Design a protein around this nucleic acid. Structure first.
Ligand SMILES: [Mg+2]
Ligand SMILES: [Mg+2]
Length: 177
DNA sequence: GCCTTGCCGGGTAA
DNA sequence: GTTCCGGCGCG
DNA sequence: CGCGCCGGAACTTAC
DNA sequence: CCGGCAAGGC
């Protein structure tokens, strides 16, 4: 498990990618698991091998696609099976065990946390998602608050109290999944 | 004096 | 980040 | 006919 | 995501 790696990738996916169920002309379809990032190196050399491992583990026969956009690389797996694997794991997020919580927060922070680490913050439109992470962090002894940060785009922020900086960086960021 | 954290605008990296 | 497109594969 | 993998790329905006 | 500012508190 693999549960760990999966939770981390789901963090990357929810933060910086998506799960897409497409309908085409006609009546064609497609199911996509997507993580996007700017660094060619981070996608190719740390994110992709983790995904590959998960593909082998689950006998997914779809290939890992890396598609180049002008402002970002997109890692893409076209797979009904991989799609529902993450989609179902998402709808079960409230039931994550601790190994899974830690992996997922770390994934989510790689995706859209404050990376200056001068402050410790996670941004998201999804307040309910932050409220879930907030509770996980409290139970791990990392105090935090949530506010509507950006009124222009509806983006909430989860602010991790710098008082628990050491506990956060060592329990979440430097955790070994 | 200094740390912390809400507020809020610019613009890259989704 | 999300959703078109034209292509192909396959029962 | 109906549906699912590939390879984009154009289009939109949430961090 | 970044980061300057200002106000609260030790
Ligand atoms: Mg996001
Ligand atoms: Mg990111």
């Amino acid at each position: 498990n693999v549960s760990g790696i999966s939770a981390y990738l789901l963090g990357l996916i929810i933060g910086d990618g998506g799960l897409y169920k497409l309908k085409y002309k006609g009546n064609r379809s497609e199911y996509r698991v997507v993580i996007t990032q700017k660094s060619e190196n981070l996608i190719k050399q740390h994110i992709a091998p983790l995904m590959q491992f998960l593909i082998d583990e689950l006998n997914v026969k779809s290939k890992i696609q890396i598609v180049k956009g002008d402002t970002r690389y997109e890692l893409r797996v076209s797979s009904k099976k991989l799609y529902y694997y993450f989609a179902n794991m998402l709808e079960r997020i409230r039931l994550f065990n601790m190994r899974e919580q830690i992996a997922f927060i770390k994934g989510l922070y790689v995706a859209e946390g404050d990376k200056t680490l001068k402050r410790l913050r996670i941004w998201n439109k999804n307040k309910a998602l932050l409220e879930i992470v907030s509770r996980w962090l409290n139970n791990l002894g990392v105090r935090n608050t949530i506010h509507l940060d950006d009124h222009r785009h509806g983006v909430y922020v989860l602010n991790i109290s710098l008082r628990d900086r050491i506990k956060f960086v060592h329990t979440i960021l430097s955790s070994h999944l």
